[PDB]
Design a protein around this ligand. Sequence first.
Ligand code: HEC
Ligand code: ZNH
Ligand code: ZNH
Lengths: 104, 294, 295
Amino acid sequence: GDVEKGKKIFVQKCAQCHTVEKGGKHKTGPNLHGLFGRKTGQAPGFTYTDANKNKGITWKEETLMEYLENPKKYIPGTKMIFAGIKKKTEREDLIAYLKKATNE
Amino acid sequence: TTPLVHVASVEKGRSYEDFQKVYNAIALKLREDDEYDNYIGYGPVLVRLAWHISGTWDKHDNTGGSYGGTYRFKKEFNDPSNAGLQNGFKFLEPIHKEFPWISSGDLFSLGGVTAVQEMQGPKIPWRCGRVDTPEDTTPDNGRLPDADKDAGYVRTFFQRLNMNDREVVALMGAHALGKTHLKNSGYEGPWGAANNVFTNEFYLNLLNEDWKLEKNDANNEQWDSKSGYMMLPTDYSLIQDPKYLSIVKEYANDQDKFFKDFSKAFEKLLENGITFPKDAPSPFIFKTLEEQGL
Amino acid sequence: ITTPLVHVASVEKGRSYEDFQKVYNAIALKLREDDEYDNYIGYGPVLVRLAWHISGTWDKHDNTGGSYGGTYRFKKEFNDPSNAGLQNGFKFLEPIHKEFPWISSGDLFSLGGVTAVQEMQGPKIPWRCGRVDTPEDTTPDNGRLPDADKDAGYVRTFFQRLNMNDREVVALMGAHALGKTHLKNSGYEGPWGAANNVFTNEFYLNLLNEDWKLEKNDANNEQWDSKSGYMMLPTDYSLIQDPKYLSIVKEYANDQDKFFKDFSKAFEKLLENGITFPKDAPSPFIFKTLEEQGL
Ligand code: HEC
Ligand code: ZNH
Ligand code: ZNH
């Protein structure tokens, strides 16, 4: 599934708040490197909320295929002001890209 | 040669409950076909359709406007100023066939109210009753504004729509949505970063970026930022004028004031030329997909 | 008995046409800015009523009342039951008087009306200056303004005190195309037409072409309502029950242009009643609209 059409999704709906590479500075959100296979509220250097580091789950393909519909439903009282992608095809393509760009 | 009145008539037996459904159908499709124009969605082209159908109004003789839904005809549809809106029309077409009773004017305008609301923007009170009028009441091409002019033209243009300085600057904030396409308008680029989220970004960008006048491949001049944003010469006019600038600064500082002023002005823009009786319903405040748990 | 009053039009100290175009313009520019009053109708209609009410107090027998004294500024005729709702038209003009302290109350209230008609695309109403502010006891008693619950006979007899003939009253009543009636102001709710902020001949067309039924409202007063949501006062409707009035209503409904020439002359006469203009008095000023100035 497209990492190429998944790049467009990230640029459009996420990039204005997130960096994906290591040594990428935190803007209105932490750097997304070291995502797949890591706990919530992980990225060293950002001041997280008492709700997100505390959700305490591993970040994998399918669990965040669900957080991606509603970032506020799967995690209460967060500062992630994103209404979520509802479709599956689009979530599939953003997740595909992310595993590439957020590690190497 | 003149004297027209356009009375609103609610599409036979239709209530508020019927209208929330057609709003939801537009909202659920904005969510579905969100792949368009590199994931911006159809939201911005729908806001612009709502304005281009309404922006053809003339207070002098009461011609043009949203009422007649004359965009469904070839003269207004093929209007060189209406280039790019065909995409918004084709989007609204399957919805028009799921709800055949709704008038073209009511659908085009509701599509604009749906777009702004689902884009995390203010609630826009909307009224039904626009009736489809025959082919001969289609306004001539050229009622829409040009983008390469000054503050003088923007002020003069909007008087034909009875818009004062506070209303035009509020309406111009819709430019926080979408982008300009070279193949349509002869201009290229977005005004902001979040061009699918209704905010006061337009004014902030206008006041804070280093704007440089550059000429594009269509041979038109546009103001560009090295942050990847652009501003039309008419959008720049708002800071080249002291009256307009006073209001741009006011909105850049307070979003909730811009939101409040946009609703009032956008509703006015879509209701211009339409006479609402007493045996007419109150403006509808539609619930967003989020508020109905959909 | 009691000797008639004589009011001589004294032009404001050192002022001319250019100075009054500036007042017109300030009123006109503010009609644009405060465009949301009374659900987007604007301040235009309430000002025509103001111009008419301060003038309709006139009595041709002793030359009391009229626009001259600018007595609307006083308690007595302010809080006059028939003037309920005009306080809004007054506080619209209040900051325009701050910018032009030199102008008299009678001249301002009357200019407010002339401007409103012109900006709402109506005919040019020639206007003259000279109204001088008179003391607190030159203020006319409440009750000189007409009743809406009467007939063609009352309407004739009333307007004779104002020195108006059958044609002038039917012409003046056409200003009812503008604005609406409000329940908490006079006991009648509703507009007379559709385009209530653009001066047309809609009033006569509506009065002739519609289906009207008499019914009491929420304030328990009877008015003529149409299925379209329009309204006519009993006095407005009795412009058609009377055969002489019906013929003039018919001609104004058929020719908007004749209504426009006749309205101007009658509207000017109304604002100029009871005022003696000296031989040396300036000619009537015809003001240019904001549109005719490119402003
Ligand atoms: C694209 C559509 C996305 C994706 C894939 C993510 N976001 Fe981001 N984000 C923002 C903030 C303020 C925060 C912190 C939340 C808090 O601490 O309260 C985040 C966070 C995330 C996380 C979780 C962080 C963690 O637990 O370590 C992930 C997985 C994430 N975001 C993914 C802010 C924003 C936005 C607005 C300013 C937008 C738009 C996005 N995020 C978009 C997206
Ligand atoms: N426009 Zn604009 N526009 C104006 C108002 C008053 C509002 C609505 C309340 C407008 C909304 C939009 C909008 C959203 C646009 C994006 C559409 C998209 O993404 O497809 C949009 N308007 C776009 C343009 C545009 C781009 C054409 C293209 O390539 O698709 C223009 C050249 C354009 C011009 C103007 C203009 C001049 C205005 C008034 C002075 C104006 C108002 N719009
Ligand atoms: C018969 C006689 C008569 C009568 C009784 C009347 C009455 C009346 C009433 C009841 C009312 C109401 C008020 C409210 O608001 O509520 C009105 C209004 C009125 N009005 Zn009108 N009028 C008259 C005449 C008139 C004239 C002549 C004119 C002018 C010139 C007028 C103008 C007017 C107006 C414009 C109005 C409206 C206002 C507003 O809108 O506010 N008017 N008036």
